[PDB]
Ligand binder design. Structure first.
Ligand SMILES: [K+]
Ligand SMILES: [K+]
Ligand SMILES: [Mg+2]
Ligand SMILES: [Mg+2]
Ligand SMILES: [Mg+2]
Ligand SMILES: [Mg+2]
Ligand SMILES: [Mg+2]
Lengths: 116, 66, 153
RNA sequence: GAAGGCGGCUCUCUGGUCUGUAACUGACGCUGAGGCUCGAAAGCGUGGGGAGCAAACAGGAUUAGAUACCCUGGUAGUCCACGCCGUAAACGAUGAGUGCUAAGUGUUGGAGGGUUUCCGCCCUUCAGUGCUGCAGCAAACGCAUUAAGCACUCCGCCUGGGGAGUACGACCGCAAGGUUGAAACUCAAAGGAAUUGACGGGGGCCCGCACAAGCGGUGGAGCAUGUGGUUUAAUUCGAAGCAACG
């Protein structure tokens, strides 16, 4: 329950952001998202929704007990900045940041465009 | 701009993939190879550097990422 | 307009209380240029407020405006296939205009026998946070908080 | 690399090209119908395989409808080996070869020279690869030592548009269909480039009670007036989006 620090996994996309706080070896400690907060439609894709997600997840995580986190960013979208600022505000000192945006190295065929 | 090649200035040749000391400065963070227009090497030497770096990567001397 | 803002004519004070809110409220409640009838209505209403309350009518009206004036509007914006609202920090003059408008409209909507009584009851209810104008305030703020996500827009 | 096309890495085998060299053969070359070979992707046959993507298809939506665009799934297929197919906006929409004809600039692979501690810089030169541009060419756009200039050799191809790349025949192909390839009849145009306008669910700049912000109305009732229909012997004639209808 009570631990020292973990990680911040922030899977931001065009439709939703999903914040997940985990221990350094992996086993999770909290998570939340815009739909969890109660957002709908395009509101899920918002920095405010990412902010509220980080708020709720940090509240639960601090209720368990911790102080600081590393930040593992992944994906497009603009919730990154607002969510990180809200981590700082709700208390978790942002130890460090790194993006792990997967580079396919030309690995897979992506689907067609949204026309033709 | 007129710039100088490390290789030309140093009079080095027969680039071995073992030469991490020389290959690692032609690499940016997370292992990416610097462009020729950044560094200032010739095409021949640049291609030899590409091959040497890829050899070093597969042989663990240097990383693909991070 | 296309050519930038427009500066408005100043406000004339009230003869007896020496205030601008009072004169602008006269202008609000007025219909067909009848400053006399409007001013009489307002002075008699504030006489009722003096009668049923020892506080100054002007202070009670200030309190009502503090309790009705919003801080956040909703402004409409049409993004292609969906038109939706956006919260907007309200300019201090727009605050007072909306306050007077809400007060006066819901006052004349109230079902009493004279505009004097209607306005006095509405102002006192607003100062005690019980009026339809305060309902309107709460509705606008709740919509601002429900569409708060568009802070960037 | 002749083209199609070819980007991780190493090895096996192998092709063409460039530079000098001026030893050697001594016009042996170029083009090249007809033939032979290669030949994007789709597609066909046999057998494997199949992560993702994805025709067909299903469902949800949208829509007047939507046999589509959007979404979620998803089969052949995409992949490997062999054998077929032999088509493309297979395009530099420019056949191959040779020579001559201002210059400028970058760049790839070299060579030579004059310097430079080497590096490097400079000058010359070959083979390519881009941009600007003189002459000239061009209907114009544009091209211009990688010509669409001046010339010569050879091959292929065109003789208005459509019918029609159809029919008949022949050849090829497992098939799909490919190669060759007309006529009847029909039009007095079809077309290229550029110009002026207009238009744009194209861009940029600006303005207007144009929107916004607001106030008050019309549309609902009754009446007045005008208009349309309709009735009428006649219901005089004119006016018809903004710009006709007190
Ligand atoms: K097959
Ligand atoms: K135009
Ligand atoms: Mg194929
Ligand atoms: Mg040119
Ligand atoms: Mg308006
Ligand atoms: Mg009416
Ligand atoms: Mg008129």
């Amino acid at each position: 329950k009570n631990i020292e620090s973990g990680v911040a996994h922030i899977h931001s996309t065009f439709n939703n952001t999903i914040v997940m706080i985990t221990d350094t070896h992996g086993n999770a400690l909290a998570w939340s998202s815009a739909g969890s907060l109660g957002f709908k439609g395009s509101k899920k894709s918002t920095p405010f929704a990412a902010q509220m997600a980080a708020e709720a997840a940090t509240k639960v995580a601090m209720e368990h007990g911790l102080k600081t986190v590393d930040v593992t960013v992944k994906g497009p979208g603009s919730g990154r900045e607002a969510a990180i600022r809200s981590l700082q505000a709700t208390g978790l000192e942002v130890t460090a940041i790194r993006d792990v945006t997967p580079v396919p190295h030309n690995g897979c065929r992506p689907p067609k465009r949204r026309r033709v | 701009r007129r710039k100088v090649d490390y290789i030309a200035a140093n009079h080095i040749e027969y680039i071995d993939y073992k030469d991490t000391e020389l290959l690692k400065r032609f690499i940016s963070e997370r292992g990416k190879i610097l462009p020729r227009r950044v560094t200032g090497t010739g095409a021949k030497n640049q291609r030899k550097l590409t091959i040497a770096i890829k050899r070093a990567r597969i042989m663990g001397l240097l990383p693909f990422v991070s | 307009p296309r050519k930038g803002p427009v500066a408005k004519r100043d406000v004339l004070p009230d003869p007896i209380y020496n205030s601008k809110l009072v004169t602008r409220l006269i202008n609000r409640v007025m219909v067909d240029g009848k400053r006399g009838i409007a001013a009489n209505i307002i002075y008699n209403s504030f006489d009722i407020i003096k009668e049923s309350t020892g506080n100054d009518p002007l202070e009670v009206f200030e309190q009502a405006m503090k309790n009705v004036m919003p801080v956040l509007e909703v402004k409409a914006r049409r993004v292609g296939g969906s038109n939706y609202q956006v919260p907007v920090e309200v300019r201090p003059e727009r605050r007072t205009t909306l306050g007077l408008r809400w007060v006066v409209n819901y006052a004349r909507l109230r079902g009493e026998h004279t505009m004097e009584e209607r306005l006095a009851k509405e102002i006192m209810d607003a100062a005690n946070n019980t009026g339809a104008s305060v309902k309107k305030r709460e509705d606008t703020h709740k919509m601002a908080d429900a569409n708060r996500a568009f802070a960037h827009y």
